[PDB]
Amino acid sequence: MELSFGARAELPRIHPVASKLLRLMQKKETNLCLSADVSLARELLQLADALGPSICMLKTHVDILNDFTLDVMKELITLAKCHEFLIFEDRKFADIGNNVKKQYEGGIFKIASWADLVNAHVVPGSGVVKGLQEVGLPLHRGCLLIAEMSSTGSLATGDYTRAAVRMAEEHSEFVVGFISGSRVSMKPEFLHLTPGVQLEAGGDNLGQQYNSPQEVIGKRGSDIIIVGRGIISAADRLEAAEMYRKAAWEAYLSRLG
Amino acid sequence: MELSFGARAELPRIHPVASKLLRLMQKKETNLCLSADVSLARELLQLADALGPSICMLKTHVDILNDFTLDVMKELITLAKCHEFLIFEDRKFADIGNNVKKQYEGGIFKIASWADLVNAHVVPGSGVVKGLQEVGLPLHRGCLLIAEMSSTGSLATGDYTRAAVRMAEEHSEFVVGFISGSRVSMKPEFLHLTPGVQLEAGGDNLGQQYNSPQEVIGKRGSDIIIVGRGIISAADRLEAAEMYRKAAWEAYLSRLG
Ligand SMILES: O=c1ccn([C@@H]2O[C@H](COP(=O)(O)O)[C@@H](O)[C@H]2O)c(=O)[nH]1
Ligand SMILES: O=c1ccn([C@@H]2O[C@H](COP(=O)(O)O)[C@@H](O)[C@H]2O)c(=O)[nH]1
Ligand code: PRO
Ligand code: PRO
């Protein structure tokens, strides 16, 4: 029933992006995604280089990157290839299909040209996925659907979460998993990534709520933890990243028996 | 019960941004918002100048504007002041509060520095509004909550729509209305803006669905129509904008008796 990341990478129905990710997770013993919520390219690239060995994925946030250029992205790709992690852009695609197609491909950011993974809200209906899919690109790309949110008052519950799971099933040629607080699909080909993670209980003053790596990976059945401030605002960032990596990895191992 | 836009502009509980908008709608006899879904600054500014007299609002889409700069925004502000329309940015704010605060103020776009209006999805809970509010700015700014969507399979229905209305009520110092398909609040201080509008029946091939100005303003009780392709893809854009303006304006008048 429960399979290692390396075995999941070989599943018949696995998407190539998911397989690549699962293989590097197994190789590096990491199921940590760094949320690089920073405003300067210098710091983004410093984090990518210093923490690259500890992470399976780096979540970029280009809408707050004051000095974004595509040359910054090219240097991030070099680090991602060297250290072996995927690039996941934070942008909350959440529009009619015709608009998300334009937003994914175009503008200054040209997200599709560099992001291995993107995430979408399911509120618009399945056109949100179909519009992203319609971007022509001869590269391997995946999408994550936001099935649950970590924040107080989230409406991504109940039938909304179920709709996200059905939408993912039905678009598995492109959708490779979920942003969720827990396992929401029983199909092992899908990835579950969980934000709202810190070692200590608490939250922020703007509705964020935290749970621990052991809780979300071990008890709630998710695959990957997404951690921003727990690392990037820590006194010792590498020490923090390693604590999060070890916590999430052991919690995952505990489900393999 | 039903009040003109000019009378609504004087309501005791009206927000200053809503009042400014309602006054110019009455003065210019327009309840049309142009959706300027274009990739070049030249075209954005050509549309703003040519169609400015016909519109109450221009919805920018900076995430697809290949040559965005803040100098383009400054020139748009000049046109908005000259022709008398508000600037509404399309970005679908849809994140935890701590992130939307950063996204509204920062990055290359500095949206809060120029957008009179923004819109947010309610799925994260009320932190999505509280985070936008927390941006310090000594200017008049408002937010619209996405209570319904026009696209096939939209999940913004039922209890989700009701949650959006409650969130708006409860944050009326900043939330000035809704993106919706119909009137969703009975409070006349709130603005209802409806996308998914074309003169003819139909849709697109990515889940957009259209209703007419008469249907959405006259029968469904909305205030403003948001029109993109019906104008910007028309053979004669000014002719189209005037047809949409006249349609929406008459439909509104029909409810005043
Ligand atoms: O439900 C969600 C979806 C996404 N994120 C993202 O994960 C990161 C959490 O950062 P932090 O609270 O660990 O600093 C942020 O970038 C935020 O967008 C959440 O926190 N919750
Ligand atoms: O429920 C919604 C919310 C927003 N819009 C926006 O309104 C415009 C509709 O354009 P068009 O279909 O009139 O070209 C697009 O920019 C889209 O983001 C919708 O169509 N539906
Ligand atoms: O579906 C695909 O594979 C391509 C890649 C980006 C979106 N379209
Ligand atoms: O609430 C307000 O009025 C200011 C303006 C932008 C967000 N904060």
Numbering used by the authors:
A (entry chain A), B (entry chain A): 223 to 479
Sentences from the paper on this structure:
Orotidine 5′-monophosphate decarboxylase (OMPDC) converts orotidine 5′-monophosphate (OMP) into uridine 5′-monophosphate (UMP) and CO2 during the final step of de novo pyrimidine synthesis, which is essential for producing DNA and RNA nucleotides. Recognized as one of the most efficient enzymes, OMPDC accelerates the decarboxylation rate by a factor of 1017, and exhibits a net transition-state stabilization (ΔG #) of 31 kcal/mol. Its unique ability lies in achieving this substantial enhancement without the aid of bioorganic cofactors or metal ions, relying solely on interactions between the substrate OMP and residues at the active site. However, the key catalytic amino acids at the active site are highly conserved, including two lysines (K281, K314) and two aspartic acids (D312, D317), which form the so-called catalytic tetrad in the sequence Asp317-Lys314-Asp312-Lys281 (numbering from the human enzyme).
Unexpectedly, high-resolution crystal structures showed xanthosine-5′-monophosphate (XMP) in the human OMPDC wild-type and thymidine-5′-monophosphate (dTMP) at the active site of the variant OMPDC Thr321Asn. We identified a second endogenous ligand for the OMPDC Thr321Asn variant, which is dTMP. Compared to the wild-type enzyme, ligand binding in the variant displaces the catalytic tetrad from its usual conformation. Using ITC, we estimated the dissociation constant (K D) for dTMP binding to Thr321Asn as 431 ± 44 nM. The endogenous ligand dTMP binds with high, nanomolar affinity to the Thr321Asn variant but also with 10∧3 lower affinity to the wild-type enzyme.
